[PDB]
C-alpha cells in the first residue's frame, strides 16, 4: 500500500480509501475495478528487497496511522505508529507466509519449528486433489471418502480453495489418558 | 496428524461403549495424549479446538487466521454462552464402569488429516527369498520380496 | 463427497437432513446455527457433520458420462 503525506487533512494517510474498497467489492459481487486498477491508480506498488531498503512500512493501517493525546489484557502486546515517515503499508502481515503455512490455524500461537513440521506434513496428507480424479489415470491416487471443510480456517485459505477441496475431517478429540494405548 | 506438527499412529480402536463420554452422550473419535502438549508448545492446537467447539455449536466457520484480534478469553466467553466450561473441559464418564472420571477432559472438535502411510503398505517379513545375481545376497525392498 | 448417512461419533442419521438444511438456508434465509437446530442436530458432533460437509458430487456430476 502506498502511504503519502498527500491530503492537507490530518496526518500521513494511506492512498487507498473506503471508496476504492467498495469499488473493488462491486466487481467481487459481479461474480470493472481490478488489481490492475489499484496499480495504475498508483495506490499500490511493487517492491523488491533492493527497493525495500529505502522505504519504511507500517504493519496495520489503522493501528499505525494516528497519534495519542482501557487496553484489553487478553490481547498480545503491540509496538507503535511513532514514525511520521511512513512510505508504505503492509496489505496483511499473514501474506509473509506461503501456501503450506497458510493452512496452519493460529501459527502465531505455536513454537516456530512445530510450524515448519506441519508445513512438511500437509504434503503427506489426503483428500480431493482435483474434481476430475475419476477421469485421470495417475500412477497412484488417494481420495478421502467424506472430506469436511475445517471448522477453524485462515482468511488466506479462501484463495487456497481449501474449503472446496479439503484434506481432512473435523474429529471430536479428547486429550485424555485412557487405557495407555 | 493435526495441523500443528502433531503426527501419530493408531494404537487401538475402541467401540462407542468402551470409549469415555460427555453426559450429553458425545464420545471422542480420537484420544490423543496430554503428554504430547507441554514439550511441543502447540498452543494453537488447543485454541483450534476451543474455537472449533464454538464454531460447531454456533454454526460458524471459526477464524483461525494468524495476526488477528481474536483471544482465548474471547472464545471462552462464547463457549460459556453455549453452556460449556469456558476453557473447553467437560466432565466425562469411564466407558467400562459408568463412573465419572475424577478428571475433566479437554473435549472438542479438531481438524485431523489422514496421512499417506498405512501400516499394511509398510509391513514386511522374509525367511529366505530372492538373491542378487552378483552378490548372491538378499534383494532390496518390500515389493521385490527383499530381506 | 455426498452427505454422510449418519454422524460418525453418535450414529444419528444425517442422511435425510441435507436437502432440507440447504432449503432452510436458501429459501427460509436462516443462519446455519438456527438451520442445524431446526433440523434437530443437537450435539456438536452432528452439527459438524452437516455444517462442515463439502458436496463435491455436484462438481463430479458436471463431467460428461
Amino acid at each position: 500500500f502506498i502511504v503519502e503525506d498527500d491530503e492537507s487533512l490530518g496526518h500521513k494517510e494511506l492512498k487507498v480509501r473506503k471508496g476504492h474498497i467498495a469499488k473493488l467489492m462491486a466487481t467481487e459481487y459481479q461474480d470493472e475495478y481490478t488489481w490492475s486498477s489499484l496499480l495504475n491508480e498508483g495506490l499500490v506498488e511493487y517492491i523488491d528487497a533492493e527497493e525495500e531498503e529505502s522505504i519504511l512500512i507500517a504493519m496495520q493501517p489503522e493501528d499505525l496511522e494516528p497519534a495519542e493525546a482501557d487496553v484489553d489484557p487478553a490481547k498480545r502486546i503491540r509496538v507503535s505508529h511513532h514514525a511520521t515517515t511512513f512510505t508504505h503499508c503492509e496489505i496483511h502481515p499473514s501474506m509473509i507466509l506461503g501456501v503450506a503455512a497458510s493452512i496452519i490455524p493460529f501459527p502465531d500461537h505455536n513454537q516456530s519449528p512445530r510450524n515448519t513440521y506441519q508445513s512438511a506434513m500437509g504434503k503427506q496428507a489426503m483428500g480431493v486433489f482435483l474434481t476430475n480424479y475419476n477421469v485421470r489415470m495417475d500412477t497412484m491416487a488417494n481420495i478421502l471418502y467424506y472430506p469436511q471443510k475445517p471448522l477453524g480456517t485462515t482468511r488466506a485459505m479462501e484463495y487456497l480453495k481449501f474449503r472446496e477441496l479439503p484434506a481432512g475431517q473435523n474429529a471430536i478429540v479428547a486429550i485424555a489418558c485412557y487405557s495407555g494405548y | 496428524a493435526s495441523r500443528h506438527g502433531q503426527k501419530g499412529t493408531i494404537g487401538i480402536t475402541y467401540r462407542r461403549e468402551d470409549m469415555p463420554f460427555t453426559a450429553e452422550g458425545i464420545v471422542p473419535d480420537l484420544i490423543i495424549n496430554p503428554h504430547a502438549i507441554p514439550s511441543r508448545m502447540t498452543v494453537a492446537h488447543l485454541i483450534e479446538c476451543l474455537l472449533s467447539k464454538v464454531a460447531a455449536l454456533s454454526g460458524n466457520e471459526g477464524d483461525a487466521s494468524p495476526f488477528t484480534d481474536i483471544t482465548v478469553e474471547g472464545i471462552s466467553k462464547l463457549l460459556r454462552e453455549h453452556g460449556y466450561q469456558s476453557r473447553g473441559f467437560e466432565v466425562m464418564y469411564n466407558g467400562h464402569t459408568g463412573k465419572k472420571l475424577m478428571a475433566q477432559i479437554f473435549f472438542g472438535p479438531t481438524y485431523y488429516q489422514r496421512l499417506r502411510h498405512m501400516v499394511d503398505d509398510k509391513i514386511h517379513a522374509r525367511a529366505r527369498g530372492p538373491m542378487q545375481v552378483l552378490t548372491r545376497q538378499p534383494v532390496e525392498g518390500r515389493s521385490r520380496d527383499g530381506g | 463427497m455426498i452427505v454422510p448417512v449418519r454422524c460418525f461419533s453418535c450414529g444419528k442419521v444425517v442422511g435425510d437432513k441435507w436437502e432440507s438444511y440447504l432449503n432452510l438456508l436458501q429459501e427460509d434465509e436462516l443462519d446455519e446455527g438456527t438451520a442445524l437446530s431446526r433440523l434437530g442436530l443437537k450435539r456438536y458432533c452432528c452439527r459438524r457433520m452437516i455444517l462442515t460437509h463439502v458436496d463435491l458430487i455436484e462438481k463430479f456430476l458436471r463431467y460428461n458420462p
Binding site: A26, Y29, R155 | N60, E61, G62, S65 | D31
Partner: peptide, 15 residues
C-alpha cells in the same frame, strides 16, 4: 470470533 461469509446478504442489502 468466526469468519463472516454473509457478505453476499450484507452487500446486496447495502448496495
Amino acid at each position: 470470533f468466526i469468519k463472516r461469509d454473509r457478505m453476499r446478504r450484507n452487500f446486496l442489502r447495502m448496495r
